[PDB]
Paper text:
The [name] effector [name] is a transglutaminase that carries out atypical ubiquitination of the host ubiquitin (Ub)‐conjugation enzyme [name] by catalyzing the formation of an isopeptide bond between Gln40Ub and Lys92UBE2N, which leads to inhibition of signaling in the NF‐κB pathway. In the absence of [name], [name] deamidates Ub at Gln40 or catalyzes self‐ubiquitination. [name], which assumes a concave shape, consists of a Core domain flanked by a helical Tail domain and an Insertion domain. Crosslinking of [name] and Ub catalyzed by [name] leads to the inhibition of the [name]‐mediated NF‐κB activation, which is essential in the early infection, whereas the deubiquitinase activity of MvcA restores the activity of [name] to allow the recovery of host signaling pathways in the later phases of infection when the bacteria have already successfully evaded host detection.
This study reports the structure of the [name]–[name]–Ub ternary complex representing a snapshot of [name]‐catalyzed crosslinking of [name] and Ub, which reveals the way by which [name]–Ub binds to the Insertion and Tail domains of [name]. Ala74, Thr230, and Trp255 of [name] interact with Gln40 of Ub through hydrogen bonding that involves both side chain and backbone atoms. Moreover, Arg126 and Thr230 of [name] form three pairs of hydrogen bonds with Asp39 of Ub, thereby further stabilizing the Gln40‐containing loop. The [name] loop containing Lys92 is held in place by hydrogen bonding between Asn318 of [name] and Leu91 of [name]. Electrostatic interactions further stabilize the binding of [name]–Ub with [name]. In comparison to the apo form, the Insertion domain of [name] underwent a distinct counterclockwise rotation of ≈30° in the ternary complex.
Author numbering:
A (entry chain C): 1 to 74
B (entry chain B): 2 to 152
C (entry chain A): 7 to 383
Write the structure that this text describes.
Amino acid sequence: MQIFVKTLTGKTITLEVEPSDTIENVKAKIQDKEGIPPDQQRLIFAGKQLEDGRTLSDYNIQKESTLHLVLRLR
Amino acid sequence: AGLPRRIIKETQRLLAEPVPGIKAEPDESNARYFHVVIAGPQDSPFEGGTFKLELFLPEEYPMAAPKVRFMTKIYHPNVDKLGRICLDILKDAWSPALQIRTVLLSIQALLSAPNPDDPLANDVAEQWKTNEAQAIETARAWTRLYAMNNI
Amino acid sequence: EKTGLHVHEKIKHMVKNYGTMITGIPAEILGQNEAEISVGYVKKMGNMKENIAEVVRKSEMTQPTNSCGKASNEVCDLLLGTEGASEFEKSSYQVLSGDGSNLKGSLPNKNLLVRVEMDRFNAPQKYQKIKREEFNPETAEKNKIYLLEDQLVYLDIFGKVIDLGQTSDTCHRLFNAITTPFYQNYILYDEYIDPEESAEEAAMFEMGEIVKAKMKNIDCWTATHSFTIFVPESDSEDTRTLYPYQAYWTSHTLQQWFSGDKDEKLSRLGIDGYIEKLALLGTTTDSKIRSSIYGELFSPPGKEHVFCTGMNEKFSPLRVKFKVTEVNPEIALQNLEEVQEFIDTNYPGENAKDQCELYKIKAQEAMTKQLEMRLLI
């Protein structure tokens, strides 16, 4: 329902979502909260990268979860 | 099935007007499978080699990207241990205005322009970035070792 | 004696030199946080100090951000300050005039900072005929067209059903014209399908031309790129040019952007010259020139002719959005000089390379100490 996203800076930011919110949605949630486009972000959860066609319940994360926002890739 | 026209016509256009340095044929059985030989580009550590690939059209093809696998052993930092290549699009995904010929061309280009700052095989990328000249030396050795005498 | 070119000068020197350090996060926090996300890369047998060492060495926590939006964000909180930029967040972006008018006219001869956002048109290119009996908007694929026996809808990114203004008689026709089973679930704008072949293909062509038409009045837009531009106070119409500041996902850092002096190279376009190119991005319908210009503006230094080719041909149409505000050299150069204090205080060294090498090391140590902690059972 409402989740956390921790950056490497330790800047935790909290979002209100829905179990049937697509992962492409959370990134736009983040866009509205941080002014970072979704194409310039990558979310991982408990090791695993999250892909754009899936939902939080399909990754099995609800209530007080932390997603790591990753803002450097190669 | 074996249609649509799109796959049919792409497969004709590939056999009719092929990509210089690239041969790409359908498999007799399975029209969505493709045997590909790409020549080592001139002015590259793979010059004078021939490299076998398989290209598969997934069953959603026109909008899923085709899967590509190097069969031939190659010393390149954008091809992993299992001959997989990064087909990733930059701040975008695969559109259907991208066809098989674009991916074939793209692999070709990648052979000329090895990118170690986007590694898929870390040991070789890591050696490509510090001892480039020793990387390339081994690259030429491998193409002699695995990519010459292949037809 | 506090210029506009003094802020360009100082922020460019400082990014170039200290990289990730301009943010002013302590190395001990980088280390801990990276340790946290990387705990699971450590091998579980052998001597742990060596296994940890191996992970800590391969790390790249100190390498600067890559997200174009996180870069532009941190430019903002320098030039404007925390509370400064927090209330520049508010300002809604103005989409760029066909020709470039609103931007030119939104550029007084103060010390201003435009922040741009750039949107790509993420319109559906998939459609699926389906029975209504089995639809379920929270079950099916989003950003797609659905063709029911008697209605033609779009499921959008959030999973809203949006009707596409078609009678049920046209829908009926279309549904029933499309019989060959691999075109039941397929793509809208296939170029190999011929209206003058089948009724099926005429249908698939027609439904596609509907959707294309409707869709040019629907917010399909999603954000793709982020940057800033800096417009220092001049004393002329020529002694005035602009300085764009970006990064890019998996491409380059602001540090890299400055070290190949792209900002300067784009300031040698002219202000009208930049905006004219930038304006054409959103208005051309030729992919080859959308690609060309995109490369010219947004590629890392030097890869301008190969950044947007083959697989990275730009096919989505784009929408440039800008918002402006002003920069008090005095608050910005205090923001920067306050960062330089932090660096010199906590990461002392007489080369800057040395100050960074100290940062990294202190990061690595922190990280090593957290992992050492975490993995003692």
